[PDB]
Amino acid sequence: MAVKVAINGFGRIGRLAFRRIQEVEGLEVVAVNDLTDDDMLAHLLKYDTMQGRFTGEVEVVDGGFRVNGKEVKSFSEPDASKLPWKDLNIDVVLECTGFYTDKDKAQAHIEAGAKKVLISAPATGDLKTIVFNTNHQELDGSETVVSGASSTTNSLAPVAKVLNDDFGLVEGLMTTIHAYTGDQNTQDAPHRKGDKRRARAAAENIIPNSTGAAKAIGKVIPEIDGKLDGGAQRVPVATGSLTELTVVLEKQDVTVEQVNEAMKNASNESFGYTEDEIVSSDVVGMTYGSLFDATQTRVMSVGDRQLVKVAAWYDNEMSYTAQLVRTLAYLAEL
Amino acid sequence: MAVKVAINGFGRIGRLAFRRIQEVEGLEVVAVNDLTDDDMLAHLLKYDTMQGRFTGEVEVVDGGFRVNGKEVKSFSEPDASKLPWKDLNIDVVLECTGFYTDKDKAQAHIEAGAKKVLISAPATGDLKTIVFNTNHQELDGSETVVSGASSTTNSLAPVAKVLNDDFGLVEGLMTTIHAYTGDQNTQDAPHRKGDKRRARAAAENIIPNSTGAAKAIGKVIPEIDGKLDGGAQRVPVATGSLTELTVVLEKQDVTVEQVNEAMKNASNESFGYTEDEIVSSDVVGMTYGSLFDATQTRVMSVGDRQLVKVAAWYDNEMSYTAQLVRTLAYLAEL
Amino acid sequence: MAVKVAINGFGRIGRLAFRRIQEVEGLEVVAVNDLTDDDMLAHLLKYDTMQGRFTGEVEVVDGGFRVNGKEVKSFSEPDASKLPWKDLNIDVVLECTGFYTDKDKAQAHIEAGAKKVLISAPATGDLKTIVFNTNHQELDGSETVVSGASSTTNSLAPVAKVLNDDFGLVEGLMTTIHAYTGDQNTQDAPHRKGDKRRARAAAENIIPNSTGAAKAIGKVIPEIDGKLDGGAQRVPVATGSLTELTVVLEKQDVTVEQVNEAMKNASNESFGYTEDEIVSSDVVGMTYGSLFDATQTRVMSVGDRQLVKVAAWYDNEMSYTAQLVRTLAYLAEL
Amino acid sequence: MAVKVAINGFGRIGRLAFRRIQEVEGLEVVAVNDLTDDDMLAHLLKYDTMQGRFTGEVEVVDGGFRVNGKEVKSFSEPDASKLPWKDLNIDVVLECTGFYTDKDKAQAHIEAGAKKVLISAPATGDLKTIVFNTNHQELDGSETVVSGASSTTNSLAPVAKVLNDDFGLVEGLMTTIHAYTGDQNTQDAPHRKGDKRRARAAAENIIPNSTGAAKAIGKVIPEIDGKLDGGAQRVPVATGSLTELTVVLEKQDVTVEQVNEAMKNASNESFGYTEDEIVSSDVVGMTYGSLFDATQTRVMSVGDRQLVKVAAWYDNEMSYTAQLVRTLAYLAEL
Numbered sequence A, B, C, D: 001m002a003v004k005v006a007i008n009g010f011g012r013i014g015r016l017a018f019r020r021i022q023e024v025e026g027l028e029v030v031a032v033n034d035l036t037d038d039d040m041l042a043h044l045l046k047y048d049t050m051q052g053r054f055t056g057e058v059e060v061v062d063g064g065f066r067v068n069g070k071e072v073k074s075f076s077e078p079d080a081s082k083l084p085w086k087d088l089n090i091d092v093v094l095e096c097t098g099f100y101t102d103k104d105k106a107q108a109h110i111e112a113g114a115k116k117v118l119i120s121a122p123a124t125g126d127l128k129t130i131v132f133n134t135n136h137q138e139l140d141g142s143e144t145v146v147s148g149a150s151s152t153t154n155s156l157a158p159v160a161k162v163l164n165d166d167f168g169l170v171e172g173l174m175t176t177i178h179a180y181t182g183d184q185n186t187q188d189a190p191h192r193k194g195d196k197r198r199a200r201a202a203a204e205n206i207i208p209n210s211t212g213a214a215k216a217i218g219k220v221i222p223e224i225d226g227k228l229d230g231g232a233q234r235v236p237v238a239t240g241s242l243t244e245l246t247v248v249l250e251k252q253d254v255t256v257e258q259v260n261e262a263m264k265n266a267s268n269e270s271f272g273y274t275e276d277e278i279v280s281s282d283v284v285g286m287t288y289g290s291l292f293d294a295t296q297t298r299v300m301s302v303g304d305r306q307l308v309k310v311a312a313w314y315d316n317e318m319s320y321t322a323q324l325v326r327t328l329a330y331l332a333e334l
C-alpha cells in the first residue's frame, strides 16, 4: 500500500529521516545501507544525543532490524551500484552518505534498480534543487535524481522570497551561525578535504567556513540568481543554527514592522514565525524548515539609504529532515 | 615614579589587567579590591582556565598577597567611596566591577582619594571613550574619569576607520560572534537584569544579544556617528570573538584586494593583520585589540551596487585588556 | 479535592516539578514564588535548554500566569514568612530555593500558613530524609517538614540497599561524575560560598567537589550509617550524571552476574535496570530515580579478597524531580 | 651527533612530540610522515587549540617544511615498510599513528631502515612497556621495538608504586575521568571499531569506556600484576584528565597524612605533587607524567577495615608526550 524507500547512509540525516517517516503514512523504509553492523545501526537509532530516545521499539534480527514490528533490511555495501534495489522494488532512495552528491554519481542507485533518488544535500549536475513550500511545485514527476538542497538553503529560501516579492531584492550578504557537524574533527587533525578550518577541534572554536547556500539560491529562486552570497561560522552547539541576512531593497522607507508582517503573512508548515526571545536549543527537534525571528529584525537608515537585516532559526538536523521528507512524499506521489 | 594603580574588581578584566601590568614598566598595582577573601584572590590569579597558569609566584600574606616579591594590599569593600585611596596615593583606579560604569558613580574613587579613574567598559556621563591607537590622542591629561570602551568597540574602531577613510562609509551593520561571559547564567535561570536571553545556559546555546558597540562607535569616531548598528550572538566558547561588519561605501568598483591592502597598511600594535585560516582559540591571549582577517573579506556586486563585508578577531579578554592597559599608561603619563 | 501545592523557587527543580505535577492527578500548583517577574517565569517554563519545550500552553495574566487554562498565582517575596499561604490554603510547599535547607528555617512556610513543607535538598535539623521506594514508608503523616534528599542520594540509595541486603555491606567509596549546576560559575570568579573549585568555569573543567550523599546515606538507610563516603567530579554536561560505587562485601565469591541479577530483581518505577551501552544524554528527561547500568559492574578478586564496583545513571534534574513529586504525592495523601 | 628521529603520524601526540624535541638537545626530527599535504601539516603545527601557538616559525618548503631554519622532510605514505628510513639514516621512529601498536606490525619501520621504534601507545607482542621514572631502567639498549605505554598508565604507575612500596597493595579499582580524544566522533555516528559508546557525540556526553591501563600495569610494575583494574569516563574537556584509584592496603591504621607524605617523598620530574585545589584546565600543557593531588586523598575506616582513595592529574596530551620524549632520549642514548 506504501511507497518503498531505501535509506543510503544511516547517518544523522538518514536516521532522523527514518524517524520522520514513521510519522507519515504512505511511506515505508524497507532497507537501509551503511558501512557498519546491525548492532551499531539499531543502537544509533534507539539513542540520539540531541534528538532524544527513539519513541518506539528496536531489536536486531536476521536480515537487519525490526522497528515496531516492521522489518527493515540492512546492508553494508559502499558501492551503491551493487545494492539489491531492483530485487526489493525500491521507489525512492534517500541518498544521505555525502558521497553521491552528483547526478551522474547518484545514477548508481538507478542502475541498481531504484526508480528515483532524492539526495540530502546540494548536488552538481542536471537536476532540480528543491526547498519544500518554496519551489517543490517545479517537480513534474519525470525526475529521477533530485536534490533536497542544504539545511541553510531551506532556512534562507522562504526568507529571501518574501524579501524579494514584497520589497524587491537588490543584493544581500548572509552569515549562518551554524552548529558543528560530522565532517568537523573532534581534535585538531588532518582534514580529509584539506580544509584547514574544518580540521580544528569542533567543540572548542568559532570556525569560519564556506557554504554555497546563498550563492546557489538561484537554483531554488531563479529571479534572484546571483544577488546573494555569504558564509558560515561553525560554533560549539551540537545542533541548531541561525541565518542572518543583510540586504538592500528597492522599496524605500522600509520599517521593522513591514518586514516582520510580510514574514508572518507567508508563514506555513515550512516557514514558522516567532516573537519570543528564543535561543538555539529551543529549535532542536523542530519541524519548520525555517523559523523567522521577528525579535532580530533591524533597519539601518542613513538619509534615503537602508540596510535591512533579518534572522531565521533552523535545526540543521530535524528542520532539514522534515523538509526532505515532505519533498520525498511529494516526489513519490507523482 | 612608578604609576600607582588600584584595581577595583579582581574579575576577568581585573586579573588580566594585573597580569599585563607585570609586563609594563612604569606601572605598579599596589592594591586590589573585590568582594572575597585573599585566598580566593590569590588562587584565581595563579589559575586561569583559558589564559593559563600565572607565570610568576603568588603567596597569601597579611595585608593581601605577595606577587614576585612585591606586596599587593587587598580590600573587601563594596562601597568604593570608603576605599583607602588617598592613604595609598593611588594615581589611577582601573574600574572593573561592572557597577561603576558611569561618570557620576565612578566619581566615588576620586572622593576616596584617587587622582583618575579608567573604566573597563562603556560608561554613561560626560566622559571620553577611548580606543587606543584610534582616538587616545583625544586625551589631554585633564580628564579624571575615562572609559576604555568595550571589547567589541576595540575590535571594530580600527576597521571602521579604514573603511571610512579609504572608501567613504555610508552605512553598515555589525554582528559579533562573541564568547560567553560572566554575566550569562550557567543554567537557565532568572537573570538579574531581566534579559530572557542572558538567562539561558551559556555554554549550550547560540544566544542573540544586544551591544551598543556599533551604535556608540560615534563616541570614538565622530565622523561616522549614527552610521553603524548591530548586535551579538553569544556562543559556547569561553573566550575569543569575531566581529563581522557589512557596509555600503561611496567609492565604486571596490575589490577584496583593495579592502585587504588598506587594512594591512593601517596595521600596528593594536590592529593586527592575518591571511591565515585561523579559528577563535588561535586568538586567546593575543594582545592586538583587533586582528583583521583577510580570508573573510567579501564583495557583493550587482550592477553598480556593492556590499562589502569584513571580519576581525579579538580575545574579548586579553585584547581588551592589552588596549585598556595601553590607554592606562598613556593617561597616567600626562 | 486536589492537593494545593505552592512552589517556592521556580528554578530548575521548581519548574520541572511544575511540569511533573501536570502529569499527576490529585496535585495542583496554585502558586509560585521567586525573585523575578511573570514574564521571566512564564518564559522559563515554556523554554528549557536540556528538558525541551513545555508541551502545553503558557500565557502571562494578571495575578501570575495561565497554564492550559488553569491559573497560577505568582509572588516576588524573598522572605517566606510573608507569603499568603494561609490565604491560598496551601497543603504543601515545595521548597526549591536552596535557602531554607533546614527545619527551623523552613518553619517559615508553616507560620505563613502552609500545612507541610517538602524540601528539594538535604536539610539539617530534626526531620526525615526521604528517598521514594527506599524509605518513604517511614512517613506517618504527622511530619510538617520533610527533605527529599539530593539527586545523588536518590541515585545511590536503591543500589546501596541491594548491596547490603544481598551481600552484607562492609564499607564503600563513591564518586559521582556529575553534570554542572547553577551554583557553579560561568567563568572563573569569586564564589559566594568561598569554594575555590565551584569558582571555576563550569563548562570548561573537570571540577572535584564535595557531596554529603554517601556520608548522609545513613539517614535514608540507617543500617549502613557511616559505611559510605565519597565525592563528585563536576563535568561539562548541562544535565545527566553517573554514580560509581566501590565496596567491600561480607559474602565471598561474588560475581558480576550475581550483583547484576540482584539489582534487576529490585527494579521498579524508581530503580531502573539496563544492559545497553548508553551515555549521559540518554538519561536526560528520564523518570527513574536511579538507572542501574549492568554493563559497568566489575569484581576485582585477589585471593579471597574482593572489591565490587557498580554504577547507576540519573538525570540530576528530572530523576530527582520524579522522586520528589512521588514523595510529595505520598506525603500529601496521609 | 644528534639522534635522528622520524615521526610517523603527525597527530596530537606526534606534533607535540615535535614541540618537545625542540626543547631537548641531542635529538632532531628529520622526517615526518602522515596522510596529508605539507600545507596541513605546517598549519597544524603552528596552530593548536588547547596547547597554544607554536612559539618558533614554520614555513612550507620543497621537501616538506622548515622549522626555525631546520628542514624537516615530509612524506605521505600509509605503508610504513615503504618509507625512506635507511636513506635518511633514522635512529628512532616515534610511532604515533595508532595503527602499528604491535611488535610485528611496527617491524615495518625496521625493514624500511630505522634502527629502533618507540610506539606512543600500549602495544601487543614481545616488547617492554615503559613509563619513565618508574621502569625505564629496564631498558638495556638491545630493544628494537618498545612501547611508551598510555597516558593513563603514566598517570597511574608512580602512584601505584608508592602505594605498594610503602603500604603493601592488596587490590584496587581505578576510574579515569578522561578528556575526549580523536577516536571519538563529533556527532553520534557509526564507530569504526564498533564501540557503541565511542560512537557518540564526544563533547556532549559522559561516556563510559574501557582502558587496559590498570589491567596492564603489571607490565610496568610486575610485583602488582593482576592487582588493579578499572575503566574510563570520557567527558567533554578537550584535554586534561584525572585518575582516581581506590585500594585496599596491608598496612593497618593508614591516614591521609601518611599517604600524602609518601607521595611527596617520591616526587620528581615525572611525578609532581600539589596541595592546591586545581581543576583540569590547570594541567593543560604540563610536563609531569602524573600530578598527585593531595587535596583528594580519602581514607574510609570501619573498624579495622580501610579503603584508601587517591587521585592524580595528567594532561593526556602533554604529560604523555613529555614522558614519551624522555623515554626516547634514554632509549637513544644506549
Ligand SMILES: NC(=O)c1ccc[n+]([C@@H]2O[C@H](COP(=O)([O-])OP(=O)(O)OC[C@H]3O[C@@H](n4cnc5c(N)ncnc54)[C@H](O)[C@@H]3O)[C@@H](O)[C@H]2O)c1
Binding pocket: A008, A009, A010, A011, A012, A013, A014, A033, A034, A035, A036, A077, A078, A079, A096, A097, A098, A099, A101, A120, A121, A150, A151, A181, A182, A183, A316, A317, A320, D187, D188, D189, D190
Ligand atoms: N546538519 C546536517 O548534519 C545536515 C543537514 C542537511 C544536509 N546534510 C547532508 O546530508 C548528508 C549526510 O550528512 P550527515 O550529517 O548525516 O553525516 P553522517 O556522517 O552522520 O552520516 C553519513 C553516513 O553515511 C555513511 N556512509 C558513508 N559512506 C557511505 C557509503 N558510501 N555507503 C553507505 N554508507 C556510507 C557513514 O557511515 C555515515 O553513517 C551530507 O551531504 C550533509 O551535508 C547534513
Ligand SMILES: NC(=O)c1ccc[n+]([C@@H]2O[C@H](COP(=O)([O-])OP(=O)(O)OC[C@H]3O[C@@H](n4cnc5c(N)ncnc54)[C@H](O)[C@@H]3O)[C@@H](O)[C@H]2O)c1
Binding pocket: B008, B009, B010, B011, B012, B013, B014, B033, B034, B035, B036, B077, B078, B079, B080, B096, B097, B098, B099, B101, B120, B121, B149, B150, B151, B181, B182, B316, B317, B320, C187, C188, C189, C190
Ligand atoms: N570579555 C569580558 O569579560 C569583558 C571585556 C571587556 C570589558 N568588560 C567589562 O568589564 C567589566 C567587568 O567584566 P568581568 O567579565 O571581569 O566581570 P567579572 O564578574 O568576572 O568581575 C567582576 C568582579 O568585580 C567584583 N565586584 C562586584 N562589585 C564590586 C564592588 N562593589 N566592589 C569591589 N568589587 C566588586 C566581583 O566579585 C568580580 O570579581 C564589565 O563592565 C564588563 O562589561 C568585560
Ligand SMILES: NC(=O)c1ccc[n+]([C@@H]2O[C@H](COP(=O)([O-])OP(=O)(O)OC[C@H]3O[C@@H](n4cnc5c(N)ncnc54)[C@H](O)[C@@H]3O)[C@@H](O)[C@H]2O)c1
Binding pocket: B187, B188, B189, B190, C008, C009, C010, C011, C012, C013, C014, C033, C034, C035, C077, C078, C079, C080, C095, C096, C097, C098, C099, C101, C120, C121, C149, C150, C151, C181, C182, C316, C317, C320
Ligand atoms: N541538579 C539540580 O539542580 C538539583 C538536584 C537536586 C536537588 N537540587 C536542589 O534544589 C534546590 C534548587 O536547585 P536549582 O538547581 O533548581 O537552583 P536554581 O537557582 O536553578 O533555582 C533556585 C530558584 O530559587 C529562587 N530563589 C532564591 N532565593 C529565593 C528566596 N529567598 N525566595 C524565593 N525564591 C528564591 C531563585 O531565583 C531561583 O529561581 C537546591 O536546594 C538544590 O540543591 C538541585
Ligand SMILES: NC(=O)c1ccc[n+]([C@@H]2O[C@H](COP(=O)([O-])OP(=O)(O)OC[C@H]3O[C@@H](n4cnc5c(N)ncnc54)[C@H](O)[C@@H]3O)[C@@H](O)[C@H]2O)c1
Binding pocket: A187, A188, A189, A190, D008, D009, D010, D011, D012, D013, D014, D033, D034, D035, D036, D077, D078, D079, D096, D097, D098, D099, D101, D120, D121, D150, D151, D181, D182, D316, D317, D320
Ligand atoms: N590523549 C591522547 O591523545 C594520547 C595520549 C597517549 C597516547 N595516545 C596515542 O597516540 C596515538 C595517536 O593518537 P593521537 O591522539 O595523536 O591521534 P591523531 O589521530 O591526532 O594522530 C594520528 C595521526 O596519524 C595519522 N595516520 C593514521 N594512519 C597513518 C598511516 N598509516 N601513516 C601515516 N600517518 C597516519 C593521522 O592522519 C593523524 O595525523 C594513538 O595510538 C593514541 O593511542 C594519545
